[PDB]
CSV table of C-alpha atoms and ligand atoms in Angstrom, one decimal:
chain,number,residue,atom,x,y,z
A,236,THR,CA,34.2,221.8,-11.1
A,237,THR,CA,36.2,224.7,-9.8
A,238,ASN,CA,37.6,227.3,-12.1
A,239,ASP,CA,41.3,225.6,-11.3
A,240,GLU,CA,40.0,222.4,-13.6
A,241,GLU,CA,38.9,225.0,-16.2
A,242,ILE,CA,42.6,226.1,-16.2
A,243,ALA,CA,44.0,222.6,-16.0
A,244,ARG,CA,41.6,221.7,-19.4
A,245,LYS,CA,42.5,224.6,-20.8
A,246,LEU,CA,46.6,223.9,-20.5
A,247,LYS,CA,45.7,220.6,-21.6
A,248,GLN,CA,44.1,221.8,-24.6
A,249,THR,CA,46.6,224.5,-25.7
A,250,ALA,CA,49.3,221.8,-25.3
A,251,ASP,CA,47.3,219.5,-28.0
A,252,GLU,CA,46.9,222.3,-30.2
A,253,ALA,CA,50.8,223.1,-30.1
A,254,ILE,CA,51.3,219.5,-30.5
A,255,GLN,CA,49.3,219.4,-33.1
A,256,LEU,CA,50.5,222.3,-35.2
A,257,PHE,CA,54.0,221.4,-34.6
A,258,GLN,CA,53.4,218.1,-36.2
A,259,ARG,CA,52.3,220.0,-39.2
A,260,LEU,CA,54.4,222.9,-39.4
A,261,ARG,CA,57.1,220.3,-39.5
A,262,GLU,CA,55.9,218.9,-42.5
A,263,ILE,CA,55.1,222.0,-44.5
A,264,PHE,CA,58.7,222.9,-43.7
A,265,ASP,CA,58.9,219.3,-46.0
A,266,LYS,CA,56.5,220.5,-48.4
A,267,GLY,CA,54.3,223.5,-48.6
A,268,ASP,CA,54.5,227.1,-49.1
A,269,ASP,CA,55.4,230.2,-46.5
A,270,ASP,CA,51.7,231.0,-47.2
A,271,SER,CA,50.8,228.0,-45.2
A,272,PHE,CA,53.8,227.8,-43.3
A,273,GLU,CA,53.4,231.5,-41.8
A,274,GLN,CA,50.2,230.8,-41.0
A,275,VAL,CA,50.7,227.5,-39.2
A,276,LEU,CA,53.8,229.2,-37.4
A,277,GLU,CA,51.6,231.7,-36.0
A,278,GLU,CA,49.1,229.6,-35.0
A,279,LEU,CA,51.7,227.9,-32.9
A,280,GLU,CA,52.7,230.9,-31.7
A,281,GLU,CA,49.1,231.9,-30.5
A,282,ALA,CA,48.7,228.3,-29.0
A,283,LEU,CA,52.1,228.5,-27.0
A,284,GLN,CA,51.3,232.1,-25.1
A,285,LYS,CA,48.1,231.0,-24.4
A,286,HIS,CA,49.6,227.8,-22.3
A,287,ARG,CA,51.7,230.5,-20.8
A,288,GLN,CA,49.0,232.9,-19.9
A,289,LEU,CA,47.2,230.0,-18.5
A,290,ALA,CA,50.2,228.9,-16.6
A,291,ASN,CA,50.9,232.2,-14.8
A,292,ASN,CA,47.1,232.2,-13.7
A,293,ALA,CA,47.3,228.6,-12.2
A,294,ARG,CA,50.4,229.8,-10.5
A,295,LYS,CA,48.6,232.7,-8.9
A,296,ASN,CA,45.5,230.5,-8.2
A,297,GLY,CA,48.2,227.7,-6.6
A,298,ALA,CA,46.1,225.5,-8.7
A,299,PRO,CA,47.1,221.9,-8.9
A,300,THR,CA,49.3,221.4,-11.9
A,301,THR,CA,50.1,218.3,-13.3
A,302,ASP,CA,52.8,219.5,-16.1
A,303,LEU,CA,53.9,216.9,-18.4
A,304,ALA,CA,57.0,218.0,-19.1
A,305,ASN,CA,59.2,221.0,-18.7
A,306,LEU,CA,61.1,220.4,-21.9
A,307,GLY,CA,58.8,222.8,-22.2
A,308,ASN,CA,60.9,225.5,-20.7
A,309,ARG,CA,63.4,224.1,-23.5
A,310,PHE,CA,60.7,223.7,-26.2
A,311,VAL,CA,59.7,226.9,-25.7
A,312,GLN,CA,63.3,228.6,-25.7
A,313,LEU,CA,64.0,226.5,-28.7
A,314,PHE,CA,60.6,228.1,-30.8
A,315,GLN,CA,62.5,231.6,-29.4
A,316,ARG,CA,65.3,230.7,-31.8
A,317,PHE,CA,63.4,229.3,-34.3
A,318,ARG,CA,61.7,232.0,-35.2
A,319,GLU,CA,64.4,234.6,-34.6
A,320,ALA,CA,66.0,232.0,-37.8
A,321,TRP,CA,62.9,232.2,-39.7
A,322,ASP,CA,62.6,236.3,-39.3
A,323,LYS,CA,66.3,236.4,-40.0
A,324,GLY,CA,66.1,234.4,-43.1
A,325,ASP,CA,68.6,232.0,-41.8
A,326,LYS,CA,67.5,228.8,-43.5
A,327,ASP,CA,70.5,226.6,-42.1
A,328,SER,CA,69.9,227.6,-38.7
A,329,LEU,CA,65.9,226.3,-39.1
A,330,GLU,CA,66.9,222.9,-40.4
A,331,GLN,CA,68.9,222.1,-37.3
A,332,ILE,CA,66.3,224.2,-34.3
A,333,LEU,CA,63.3,222.2,-36.5
A,334,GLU,CA,65.0,218.6,-35.5
A,335,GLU,CA,65.9,219.8,-31.9
A,336,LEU,CA,62.0,221.2,-31.7
A,337,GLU,CA,60.8,217.2,-32.7
A,338,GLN,CA,63.3,215.9,-30.5
A,339,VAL,CA,61.9,217.6,-27.3
A,340,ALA,CA,58.1,217.1,-28.2
A,341,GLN,CA,58.6,213.4,-28.9
A,342,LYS,CA,60.5,212.9,-25.4
A,343,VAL,CA,57.3,214.8,-23.7
A,344,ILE,CA,54.1,212.5,-25.5
A,345,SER,CA,56.3,209.8,-25.1
B,159,CL,CL1,49.7,219.2,-19.9
B,160,CL,CL1,71.4,225.6,-32.4
B,161,CL,CL1,66.1,217.2,-26.1
């Protein structure tokens, strides 16, 4: 098809990467180790940047966007706080911010 579907397909793919990766980060946090955790942490942020960049391109070409959410803004702003909490070592934040994140995700996917 057009390059506008390729963008629609990649928005959808990157959202699925983030959804997948957030589920795994979530449970490493109930388990695992800074090793895997920090690794999944960066994967999730890599997916979300791709998604964001794809979104800019769809907006440029005015592509007909079907956006499953926008707790998307909610999710991204909460994920930025989570990273600041992690990087600050602030562990009590981490648990609160991780719950809010799981709540947004489930609101979108269901
Ligand atoms: Cl989507
Ligand atoms: Cl908070
Ligand atoms: Cl919410």
